[PDB]
Design a protein around this ligand. Structure first.
Ligand SMILES: *[C@@H]1O[C@H](CO)[C@@H](O[C@@H]2O[C@H](CO)[C@@H](O[C@@H]3O[C@H](CO)[C@@H](O[C@@H]4O[C@H](CO)[C@@H](O)[C@H](O)[C@H]4NC(C)=O)[C@H](O[C@H]4O[C@H](CO[C@H]5O[C@H](CO)[C@@H](O)[C@H](O)[C@@H]5O)[C@@H](O)[C@H](O)[C@@H]4O)[C@@H]3O)[C@H](O)[C@H]2NC(C)=O)[C@H](O)[C@H]1NC(C)=O
Lengths: 222, 206, 228, 209
């Protein structure tokens, strides 16, 4: 074997609706022990329930969701679809589609999953500033231990697309993780202790995007 | 509903165990893994039986009202997140609190709080930040203090929780709020926080 | 009042759903005389209805795509949602929500329309706008109708907006035919009509904003020429 | 479905009809306009009847086959497109095929123009987009005399289907989006365009030559 390809939009405004799609490999049989499900999770918190399809057109959900929520497949279109009303910001979450199977009389397996997605949600209230320097052009740190850029002004929703490490050098240049700076408005950058001073020997000039307002931006001094 | 503890630890190939609630009617209650929100994995069918194509370093036991993931031989994946959950009723799930764990017995990590000063160019971004860097604490802990000599302050909320690392040497940041008008108002801020009982000063300049 | 709008995302992968929403203003969910519908506008040509709700809380849609279409309105919001299941490139259109009005006994018209929203189906994805100012440059001034603008290139999809001087100077503006590049990217050179001779005593500033991102920018352009 | 003619033609301040002529079994009827692709504008609220928008020059009229719109005082807006809307076959709604109206014998006018080399941000990227704002012309048609150094048709061509303007008169602005080899080979750009008759001129020097 089974697979569960998962697909949907990446990002949306607050107050909008959400919808998402999932398609299996292996059978669509209406009968069998098999059933289908969905899950979500805000980053910084636990995984949580939404809804399922059992054997036959049997379906249900937590009553706490009920009026916001609806769910239908089209297996003639090979697809499962979940639909939700009016995102409050905390509905911003990871999402996943999944599979169920039958054991005993009304007791069941809960065991297999697609790749999942970030349903990004934010206010549209955002601006067009550049990235800006931290570089030794002013005496922040010595040439032997600096990073040159990767700060974007300020805004209401995080994040700037900050990243470090993930090459073969998994140790010694290990990360300093970041997610917020409430500097009158929200704001991001991060640094590692590597030598730099300029783009002259390696790509130490650091250029970046602000994900709630997609526009990658560049700035250099050396 | 369920409940789970925040974290537990021992070294690789040692034994340790993780608590959960449960029910006798809902004895189809089961343990799970998920690593940093990616691609979950089920461990047990009901509370005690490992399914085919799942390995055997561990047991949830037949523990009914309290599902109980013990481990015989710990491995590096045993500080992914781990969850406890069950079938509800009438087409509904039931799901638990998670636990990030740690495999303490690894080398460890100490004591790498550090301050990088701003640059004069940073003021273009409406900032002159304390680049108050946080890595290498074991387990990861900090407590609030801060200073800026005799100045008043507007510090923000800039401290992250402890978080995942490329070499497991646990890390965070606390990049203090400093805007360009705040910088002109207050200037001489410092990275005063208790990184596993250690701290740094290096009061800033542009 | 009345006002109406079709808020949603700009583009979609072929086999996915479309899902989009619309809002009431200046009226009641109970009006016997008036109700709500959805519509779409084929590229550069024809027009095509889809579906309705009315105050009686009954529902209707065209046969000819039935299983592919859906409507409901969540009374906890009192906002109206349109859904379409599994697209094709030829679904690319301006979708429109609108308020129905009826003489009754099955006698209706549409009384108001929103601005619409454009929707594009593709296997591709978005590319950010690239920008620079337009004015009479170092080698020109003597234009036969003088103009100033925020020039934008290599964008996709289309939605972007422009004005001058704090976003207020907007004399003699319009949308020219949009440029296409063979990569699938697009470009523009839309302008405010403004005199070139005034700059020693009266001079001007660009304002522009994208929409798939709200990339709002202003740029002063006050001395750009150096010749006739 | 509801058939309509593709267009009809009468001249300025004259009068004409459009009608919708298919399965018009539905017999209370409405009519609508779209112009320059903006949000559609109503005309007829029931088959003989209209509100505050255009309360004199248009008129609504009854026939079983020809669901009929009749129009007088024809002016520069009447290059638009027009549509019928009967009520449908019960619980149902319809549109006509549209009619892109074509008022003839109007003024138209050859262009007025702004024409410029690119700002340095593209020269820093080794691309050389000279632009002509082919603008302010009538009728909504083009014939080109911009042959100077191949300027009419290269790289990012919107020497293509025009659009209306807020000054009413049409525009068709277009690029020469080549590399810096533009200045090494093309040195004049005389933006002559014809609109059933006449021309107007603008050019510039190359940027780097
Ligand atoms: C006592 O017992 C009574 C019977 O003895 C009960 O009465 C019955 O009540 C129900 C409603 O609760 C009513 O339901 C009918 O359901 C139909 C099928 O769902 C519906 O038809 C629609 O048809 C389209 C076709 O494409 C479908 O796609 C729709 O899904 C479908 N349903 C819906 C929800 O749309 C019937 O529609 C009625 O209404 C229209 C009205 O049209 C006119 O009014 C509009 C007002 O806005 C106006 O815009 C239009 O221009 C029209 O002028 C009619 O055309 C239909 O004929 C029909 O009247 C309908 O909802 C049953 O019909 C009732 N039965 C009878 C025989 O009347 C009663 O509830 C019980 N009460 C108690 C106290 O127990």
């Amino acid at each position: 074997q089974v697979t569960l390809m998962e697909s949907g939009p990446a990002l949306v405004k607050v107050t909008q609706t959400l919808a998402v799609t999932c398609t299996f490999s292996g059978f669509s049989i209406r009968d069998s022990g098999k059933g289908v499900a969905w899950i979500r999770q805000p980053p910084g918190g636990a995984l949580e329930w939404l809804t399922s399809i059992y054997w036959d057109d049997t379906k249900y959900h937590d009553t706490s969701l009920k009026p916001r929520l609806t769910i239908f497949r089209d297996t003639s279109q090979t697809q499962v679809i979940l639909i939700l009303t009016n995102m409050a910001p905390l509905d911003t979450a990871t999402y996943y589609c999944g599979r169920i199977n039958n054991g005993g009389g009304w007791k069941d397996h809960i065991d297999f999953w697609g790749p999942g997605l970030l349903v990004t949600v934010s206010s549209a209230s955002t601006k067009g500033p550049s990235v800006f320097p931290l570089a030794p052009s002013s005496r922040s740190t010595s040439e032997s231990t600096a990073a040159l850029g990767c700060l974007v002004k300020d805004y209401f929703p995080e994040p700037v697309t900050v990243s470090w490490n993930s090459g073969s050098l998994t140790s010694g240049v290990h990360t300093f993780p970041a997610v917020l700076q409430s500097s009158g408005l929200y704001s991001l950058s991060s640094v590692v202790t590597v030598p730099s001073s300029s783009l002259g020997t390696q790509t130490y000039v650091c250029n970046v995007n602000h994900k709630p307002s997609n526009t990658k931006v560049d700035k250099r001094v050396e | 509903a369920l409940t789970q503890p925040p974290s537990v630890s021992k070294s690789l190939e040692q034994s340790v165990t993780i608590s959960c609630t449960g029910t006798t009617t809902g004895n189809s209650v089961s343990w799970y893994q998920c690593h940093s929100g990616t691609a979950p994995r089920l461990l047990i069918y009901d509370v005690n039986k490992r399914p085919s194509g799942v390995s055997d370093r561990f047991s949830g036991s037949k523990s009914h009202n309290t599902a109980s993931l013990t481990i015989f031989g710990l491995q590096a994946e045993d500080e992914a997140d781990y969850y406890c959950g069950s079938y509800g009723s009438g087409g509904s799930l039931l799901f638990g609190g998670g636990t990030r764990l740690t495999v303490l017995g690894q080398p460890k990590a100490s004591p790498t709080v550090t301050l990088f000063p701003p640059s004069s160019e940073e003021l273009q971004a409406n900032k002159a930040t304390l680049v108050c860097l946080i890595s290498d604490f074991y387990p990861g802990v900090v407590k609030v203090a801060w200073k800026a000599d005799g100045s008043a302050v507007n510090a923000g909320v800039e401290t992250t929780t402890p978080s995942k690392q490329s070499n497991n040497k646990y890390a965070a940041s606390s990049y203090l709020s400093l805007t360009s008008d705040q910088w002109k108002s207050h200037k001489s801020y410092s990275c005063q926080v208790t990184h596993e009982g250690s701290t740094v000063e290096k009061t800033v300049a542009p």
